[PDB]
Design a protein around this ligand. Structure first.
Ligand code: NI
Length: 341
């Protein structure tokens, strides 16, 4: 059964609610982004209207085979009427195709559902500037002050400089980047650009990237692993055994691997600056964990909420324990007392 924080009151709508069967009263199912915890339950046998971005709809059609007649793509930054209710989709600064949804309820209430997002000051000049929001359904993944990490631009600067140094010292080094979902594509694309290479990958991952509307993608990626010196592998293979095994397959073209594991936050963030990050090394294999986040830090979340000044907040992440829920409620009240709303 569908939980309350996935339902939009006063409408026939749900958000990210495909794992509960037929939801009673639902006339339109919104999907914020193509991550498995959110799309859980969708397939070629789904027969209700799905509303989403163009990129999410390309993924639904090619990867899950949902039939075309049930996919309803909406442009971003554009007022649209769905089943008699005005909605807007906004860029969530998460993975490709990810959106926030503004719902203008028939009674005058305005609701923002962030989906998954990485808050940014540029959102203060979107269509959000123009009116009040009564209720905020918020991605609270990192809602605690210990969750610190650098900007995505600092993280990519570190990765590019690390890779370029290593391969210039040793032209026979291979670079490998882990992946298990869409998102974080700048990590492997930036590294391949500095090295003058295409990115090599499986047919399955090439297919997924071809759905993303990235400019000039045919110039950037390939399934011909032999022509490429940046390879993508599943995240599970990014360890000493998996990387050893991969280097065997390359026919003595290479004699060293440098590998990246983009994670979210890890508690090595509570001590170390990005500049000071070191790898784990065994023999001719070195593995860097790099804190590339597609979710808000605590400080970015707090800035966004204090600017928006919602009347009520409904968390959408960390909702399963009493301790988590209590901690998040404390911070929401601090923020409100500090800013005066
Ligand atoms: Ni996500």
């Amino acid at each position: 059964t569908c939980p309350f924080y996935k339902k939009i009151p006063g409408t026939g709508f749900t958000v990210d609610a495909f794992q509960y069967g037929v939801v009673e009263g639902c006339t339109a199912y919104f999907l914020t982004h193509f991550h498995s915890d959110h799309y859980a339950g969708l397939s070629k046998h789904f027969t209700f209207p799905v509303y989403c971005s163009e990129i999410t709809g390309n993924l639904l059609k090619n990867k899950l085979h949902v039939q075309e007649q049930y996919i309803h793509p909406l442009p971003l930054d554009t007022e649209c009427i769905v089943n008699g209710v005005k909605v807007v989709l906004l860029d969530a600064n998460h993975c490709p195709g990810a959106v926030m949804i503004l719902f203008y309820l028939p009674n005058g209430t305005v609701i923002l559902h962030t989906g998954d997002f990485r808050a940014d000051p540029s959102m203060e000049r979107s269509l959000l500037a123009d009116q009040k929001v009564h209720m905020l359904y918020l991605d609270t993944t990192y809602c605690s002050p210990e969750y610190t990490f650098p900007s995505q631009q600092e993280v990519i600067r570190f990765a590019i400089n690390t890779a370029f140094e290593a391969v210039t010292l040793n032209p026979h080094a291979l670079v490998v980047c882990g992946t298990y979902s869409i998102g974080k594509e700048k990590v492997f694309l930036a590294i391949a650009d500095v090295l003058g290479s295409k990115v090599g990958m499986s047919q399955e991952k090439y297919k997924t990237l071809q759905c993303l509307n990235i400019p000039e993608i045919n110039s950037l990626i390939t399934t011909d692993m032999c022509s490429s010196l940046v390879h993508l592998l599943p995240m599970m293979q990014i360890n000493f055994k998996g990387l050893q095994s991969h280097l065997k397959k390359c026919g003595g073209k290479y004699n060293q691997i440098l590998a990246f594991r983009p994670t979210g936050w890890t508690h090595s963030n509570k001590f170390t600056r990005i500049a000071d990050v070191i790898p784990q090394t065994k023999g001719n294999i070195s593995i860097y964990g790099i804190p590339y986040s597609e979710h808000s830090s605590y400080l970015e979340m707090k800035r966004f909420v204090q600017w928006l000044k919602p009347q009520k907040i409904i968390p959408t992440v960390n909702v399963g324990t009493w301790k988590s829920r209590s901690t998040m409620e404390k911070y929401f009240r601090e923020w409100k007392l500090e800013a005066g709303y």
